Amino acid sequence: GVQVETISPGDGRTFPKRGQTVVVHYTGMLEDGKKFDSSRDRNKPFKFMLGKQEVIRGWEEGVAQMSVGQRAKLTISPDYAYGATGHPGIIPPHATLVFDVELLKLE
Ligand SMILES: C=C[C@H]1CN(Cc2ccccn2)C(=O)[C@@H]2CCC[C@H]1N2[S@](=N)(=O)c1cc(Cl)cc(Cl)c1
Numbered sequence: 874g875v876q877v878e879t880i881s882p883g884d885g886r887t888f889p890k891r892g893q894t895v896v897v898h899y900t901g902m903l904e905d906g907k908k909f910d911s912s913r914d915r916n917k918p919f920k921f922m923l924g925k926q927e928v929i930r931g932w933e934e935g936v937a938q939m940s941v942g943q944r945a946k947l948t949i950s951p952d953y954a955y956g957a958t959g960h961p962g963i964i965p966p967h968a969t970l971v972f973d974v975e976l977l978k979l980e
């Protein structure tokens with residue numbers, strides 16, 4: 874599944890609700906710590922619509938547990954990410970993924 878560990882607290886009031894656009898900065902790492910992607914590198918926040926499944930399961934379930942402003946670590950088992958196949962060119966087979974996610978805003 875997805876384990877969510879707080880790095881720094883959010884507002885403790887406002888969580889992502891189904892259908893909202895969730896706006897974050899993230900860095901994604903393999904379990905050995907090698908970075909594979911960051912929205913900070915693109916200088917552009919990442920947005921996704923909660924419930925639309927435009928992101929992996931562990932993001933849908935994990936980021937929903939964050940309150941606005943919060944920074945957390947999400948640790949995601951392969952079955953809640955890209956599984957046995959992994960993802961061509963970026964994610965190895967059977968990869969547990971760790972993401973640093975800061976929840977910036979909801980729209
Ligand atoms: C860049 C957008 C996302 C891509 N997806 C969905 C996705 C969409 C297209 C292909 C593969 N996966 C995702 O579900 C996750 C979580 C949200 C941030 C990022 N990824 S990611 N694990 O950082 C990532 C980043 C990159 Cl450049 C490629 C891949 Cl195959 C996966």
